[PDB]
C-alpha cells in the first residue's frame, strides 16, 4: 500500500464547506515532498512543522479534510482568524498541527453559466468550536419575532450559494482546499513516512 494522498487531492467530488468530508488515513507511507515542490499548489502553508523537515517525521494519525471555498477567503482558514466562513463553518484549532493546501480549480469544478452546487453558511446562532460541522437547516431566529419554522421576516435560511462563473474576478474564483491535521505522540503510529 501507498497512501491515497493523491486520490483525495484530485478527487472527482469535493463537498460544500458547510458539510465537509473527513477521511482517516491509516497504516501507510506518504511522500509529502512531491506535493511540496509541485507548482500545482497555490498555497501549501504548514503550521506546527516546516514542510522541508516533514520528510522524515513519523506520525500517529493524519486526517484528510475537504471543502471548496473561493480565493478571497483562503486566508480565513488558519488558527485564530475571525470571519464568517471561518467562524460559522470550519475553524482550525489554535494549536492545529498540519498544512492547509489550496489550488485554483476553475478549470474542473466551475462550469460556464455558473456552478451553484457549492453552499456556505452565513447566519448562525453561535460560533462553532474547533472541528465542528453543522448540517442543520433550522431557520435562524435572528429577529426578536418568533421564527416558528417558516422563512421570511427574521427567518433566514442559513445556506447561500456562491456565484461561481468562469469569468468572475480573480478573488471570487473557485479554490479546492484540503486540510491535513497531524498528531505526534509516543505510540504505534499509523503513518511513519518513508523510513
Amino acid at each position, epitope marked *: 500500500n501507498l497512501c491515497p494522498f493523491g486520490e483525495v487531492f484530485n478527487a472527482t467530488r469535493f463537498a460544500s464547506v458547510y458539510a465537509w468530508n473527513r477521511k482517516r488515513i491509516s497504516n501507510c507511507v506518504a511522500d509529502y515532498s512531491v506535493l511540496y515542490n509541485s507548482a500545482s499548489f497555490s498555497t501549501f502553508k504548514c503550521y506546527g512543522v516546516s514542510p522541508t523537515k516533514l520528510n522524515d517525521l513519523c506520525f500517529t494519525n493524519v486526517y484528510a479534510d475537504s471543502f471548496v471555498i473561493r480565493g478571497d477567503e483562503v486566508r480565513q482558514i488558519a488558527p485564530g482568524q475571525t470571519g464568517k466562513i471561518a467562524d460559522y463553518n470550519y475553524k482550525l484549532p489554535d494549536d492545529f498541527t498540519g498544512c492547509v493546501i489550496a489550488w485554483n480549480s476553475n478549470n474542473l469544478d466551475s462550469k460556464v453559466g*455558473g456552478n*451553484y452546487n457549492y453552499l456556505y453558511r452565513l447566519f448562525r446562532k453561535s460560533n462553532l468550536k474547533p472541528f465542528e460541522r453543522d448540517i442543520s437547516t433550522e431557520i435562524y431566529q435572528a429577529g426578536s419575532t418568533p421564527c416558528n419554522g417558516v422563512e421570511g421576516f427574521n*427567518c*433566514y435560511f442559513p*445556506l*447561500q*450559494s456562491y456565484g461561481f462563473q468562469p469569468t468572475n474576478g480573480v478573488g471570487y474564483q473557485p479554490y479546492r482546499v484540503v486540510v491535513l491535521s497531524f498528531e505526534l505522540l509516543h505510540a504505534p503510529a499509523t503513518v511513519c513516512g518513508p523510513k
Partner: nanobody, 117 residues
Framework: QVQLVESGGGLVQAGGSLRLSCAVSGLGAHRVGWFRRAPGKEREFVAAIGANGGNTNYLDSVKGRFTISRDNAKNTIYLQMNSLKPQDTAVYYC????????????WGQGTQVTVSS
C-alpha cells in the same frame, strides 16, 4: 439589477392545477421565493428554492401538494399548485435575496390566481 416578471395567473376550477412559471433576469446566484397575499392577510412564505438545490422549506398549509423546479437555463422558476383548496386564493409574487437583511431585496409585481368552487 434583477427584475422578475410573473406569468401564469388566472382563475381555475376547484381542484385544478395552474402552472405558475415566472421569467427571471439575472438569476443563478440569488435564491428565489414564492409569497402570497390572502384577501385580508399579510404575506406568509409559500416556497423558495436555492439555485441548483433541493433545499425546500414549505408552510405546513401548503405542505405535500406544492413543489418547485429550477431550469437554470431559461431563467425561470416553476410552481405546480396541485389540488388547490378553495380558500388558498392569493396573489403570488416572485422574490430574490442578496445578503438577506430585513427581508428579500427584490419584489416582482406578480400575478393573480383564483380558484372557483
Amino acid at each position: 439589477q434583477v427584475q422578475l416578471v410573473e406569468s401564469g395567473g388566472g382563475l381555475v376550477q376547484a381542484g385544478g392545477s395552474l402552472r405558475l412559471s415566472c421569467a427571471v433576469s439575472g438569476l443563478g446566484a440569488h435564491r428565489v421565493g414564492w409569497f402570497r397575499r390572502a384577501p385580508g392577510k399579510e404575506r406568509e412564505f409559500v416556497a423558495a428554492i436555492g439555485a441548483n438545490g433541493g433545499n425546500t422549506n414549505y408552510l405546513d398549509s401548503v405542505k405535500g401538494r406544492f413543489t418547485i423546479s429550477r431550469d437554470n437555463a431559461k431563467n425561470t422558476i416553476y410552481l405546480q399548485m396541485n389540488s388547490l383548496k378553495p380558500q388558498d386564493t392569493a396573489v403570488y409574487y416572485c422574490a430574490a435575496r442578496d445578503i438577506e437583511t430585513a427581508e428579500y431585496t427584490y419584489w416582482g409585481q406578480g400575478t393573480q390566481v383564483t380558484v372557483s368552487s
